[model samples]
Target chain A: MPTLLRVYIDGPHGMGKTTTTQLLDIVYVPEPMTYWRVLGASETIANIYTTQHRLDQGEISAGDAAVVMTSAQITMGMPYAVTDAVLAPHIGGEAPPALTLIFDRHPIAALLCYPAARYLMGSMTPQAVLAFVALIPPTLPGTNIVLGALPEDRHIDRLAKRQRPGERLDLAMLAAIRRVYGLLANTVRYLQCGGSWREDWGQLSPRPHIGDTLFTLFRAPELLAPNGDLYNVFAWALDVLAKRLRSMHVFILDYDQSPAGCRDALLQLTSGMVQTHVTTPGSIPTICDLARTFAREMGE
Target chain B: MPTLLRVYIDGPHGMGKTTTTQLLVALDIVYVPEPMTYWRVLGASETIANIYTTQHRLDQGEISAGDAAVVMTSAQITMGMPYAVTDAVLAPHIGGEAPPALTLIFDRHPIAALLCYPAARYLMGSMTPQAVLAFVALIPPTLPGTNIVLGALPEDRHIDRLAKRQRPGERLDLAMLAAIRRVYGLLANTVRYLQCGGSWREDWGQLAGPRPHIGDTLFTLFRAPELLAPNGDLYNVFAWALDVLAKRLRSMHVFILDYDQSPAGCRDALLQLTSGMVQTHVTTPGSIPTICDLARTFAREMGE
Candidate 1:
């Protein structure tokens, strides 16, 4: 049994990777380390680092099944570099695996490369250290990229609202990174979205089977957030994913959200996904069948 | 700062002591050693006995400030009687200083006395042999005895259900214990509602106050299997406690119950208590004010 449906999402800061992950019905495995000052705890950092290492090594525990969703600032951490090293053997000097890996990140992989290369050359800027280290991997196949296309002024406004220690400098660096992402998405297999992005990138297409019914409803005036809810975007994506996966008999949906918004977003997405994939809406027999299928899948 | 509002609630098993405690606004400090059983590695009874000594004495650091709701089984374990002897000196003796201490047990002071009684003969059923030795000096004074005064048929039915866990000999012993509780209210105060006597003994009255308005609404409908639905017993109890406590200018109420039903029951009781005391009906501003006020009192009195 596959322990993880390893979904990798690459993006610049505040590009909605967090929001998308919250929407999906998968086990969210957060990045182990970042340059953020607030994440100072050694144990927390170590836990993430080890978990990521285990994922790269494919050393997951037996009988533990989960859709492992990972979100990393591909341009601001050693995650990309480290994953490159570990997966290089598996990549076998080729275009990487054909397995579906949901990659969420800013398209600034090239800009991130410049800083990473600078660090590799032994000269560093506060903004350039980890940013440079994350550009090591060869972009793999079956990797779905979400192009975040909020207006530059909107981006700046969003960044301004985020209050963190030494935030002004972080925001300035993040703004630069966002510009880089915009440049990269122009040449990649990216889905352009308003405020947030949503796409179905899996072997089974969740779109035609379920997207029409479930995804269409959420496009309602009341459903959309005034400030473009990142969660709404995520839910839309997960609904697509779940519908697609269910077609292949992968009926399980696990929610891993640290905060409340993420959970709600996922719930909405799941409900939408159900609306699309499983017909006979609001019918007791259909509901019971879905429930029974869910229970059976859980047991598996 | 006072760390706990300790009270001794003396009642037979299943007599609503746990239920009543659940009705208060306080943090339930379960015996830490007991929680270990939930973990797969320490699920064995032997592991429980081994870690029982050290873990039992460890302080509960995880509880939040101003959490007045707490309930713990008797400090003296019959299986490990000597453990109580060792920790005898550390027990709190006074009561009503800040948070009232509530201890739930079938038999109270007797087991406590037996643990400290100098004579070797007093140690028979007094202390369990596999016990850790620690000493404490004080014990709280407020003791509320609980009783279930339903018809004999219902009582027998309840007992029969309980007998599922009993052996032939143990069944007789359990029956005797039930009889004793029914006859003498198990050596504590009895406040008679129906045929059975049940009453608040020790310093119970001292702890009673005007319930906050929400608590008053809860208390008025105090019934079994507490919950917050239309006409739920638990909700009524919370309203009652809140009303009573609020009227007394207590402002806060902490009720503790067994983990299973405690949260819902206590919440209801506090809601009722608050409502009755304030004599207002609107749900807006809800229970936050009362919860916050109680939290402050809990912090001040229990060193939360």
Candidate 2:
């Protein structure tokens, strides 16, 4: 059995993830821009930003924005999820072993983080985000997710330089996404480092406090009781969130460097990633072909 | 928080479940009757009638298998929609694992529409095994403290019981009866297999064993020639759906209700089984009442 290294490069838009991953040896799955733009719906990213903008300015109700956002997210994440689920069996054990595939962003970007970010931006309901959370495909073994870190100013500059077809420079969305990703990384650490979130599964935990972990995001007033604890349903969602993200091996990549430097740095980070043995001897070529096919079919 | 006992009574139909559940109702208990109104009128008129007729046509060699499959697939979706949406809407309001101050009894769960019926349709050659697994993929994640009561009746007695009751659009098709019976039987066994720490990934080689091999599963029924690749392995997409099915059904608390007895005896048995059903906390002090209302409203609105 050969090993397969599966790495998902993810963070806020304009973080040089795509460009950096392009330099890697493995199959690179670009974000499904075509699907979002034309297939899922025309100008989906444009519509998303405009919806959030309208909600922010009180021109549209959050309810209206939420419906479109939820539907659009399903379209955005379906390919990634379906592809991963199909490819799960062929993927094998830890490596300098067989084939490596670099994904542009994981399904969590659309399913969990983006919806979460929209929730923070007041455009999506907490319930809607939790619904997406529940639908996240089960995580497979040896899943390595690399998140990006860039200074806010540099991120803004990069954002202005390369806006996608339907994108605009919305700093609020940028801030929200950044915060969500940051919390995502921390929540992984919190779970891996043995934070007291286990108590959440069995019995009620202490008072819900604002924190850097992903669980803090659910402390919205809609989900809170009079005593300030999260309602049980939403808490169960947090449990789902914790379960999905906890097993993922998270690596932070410094994206402020040059594109070449970032790519090299990402490559360096791969040394610590967990790889798994492929199910069969033929799994390597089969997975390599699958990765290439997914790139062509689902990517840009 | 009030203790909410959520019980889903499910099995092959026509086993006197509805009649028995009706006899066991209490002031605090809410019975969610099957969405017959939704199925027969609201979503599509004569849905059951349509389903049975499609199979009847295919059986009589009037329509092609594809024609039967297309109708069965869409009809199953329509049948399952209310169940899916209701579960999703009610999911956030229900909290974690309890005994009941309030009992919510459902006639059939989403699995009946999503898993059992579709698999039965597959067996009757009206639907594809691939499509059956597709419905399996969409089965909602099992919530905490989900206690599902399935029926146990000997085939001979079940045949007699089924012959006595036929709803609108329902027919006396022994093939469908056998298909549904086998599917549900496999369901109970599959849950048992999973509970015993049997993994399909690890136990694929043991599929040929006489003692409840993997062949005894709904999955085995899906190894149709068209669904497999040249090497004879099921495609990864369909295989993943089986993974989803296993994960979703494994956590459920299953109890077998003896349906061969009299209706009163069956009701008493189900009522006794509730003592062992796990309960869960509601989201609020008033949540139990709200859930009761939801169940009652669903029954009223969707009932015949």
Best by DockQ: 2
Model 2 chain B — which ten-residue stretch has the worst lDDT?
A: B204-213
lDDT of 2: 0.75
For model 1, the docking class works out as: incorrect
Per-residue C-alpha lDDT of model 2 across residues B1-304, encoded as one tens digit per residue? 6788888999998888888888888418888888887677555568899889989999999989866775676577657766765676567667888547788888888899878998888888988665566556657768888889999888888888778699998999988889898999898888877777767867665551233567776657766775565677755545556777788888988889999898888988888998878988878777777787777767766787
Range of the 10 consecutive residues with the lowest summed lDDT in candidate 2 chain A: A201-210
Docking class for model 2 is incorrect
Q: Relative to the unseen true structure, what is the C-alpha lDDT of residue B29 in candidate 1, on a scale of 0 to 100? A: 30
Error at A11, model 2, angstroms: 0.9
- Report lDDT (Cα) of residue A142, candidate 1: 25
For model 2, the stretches where C-alpha displacement exceeds 4 angstroms are: A92-95, A198-210, B1-304
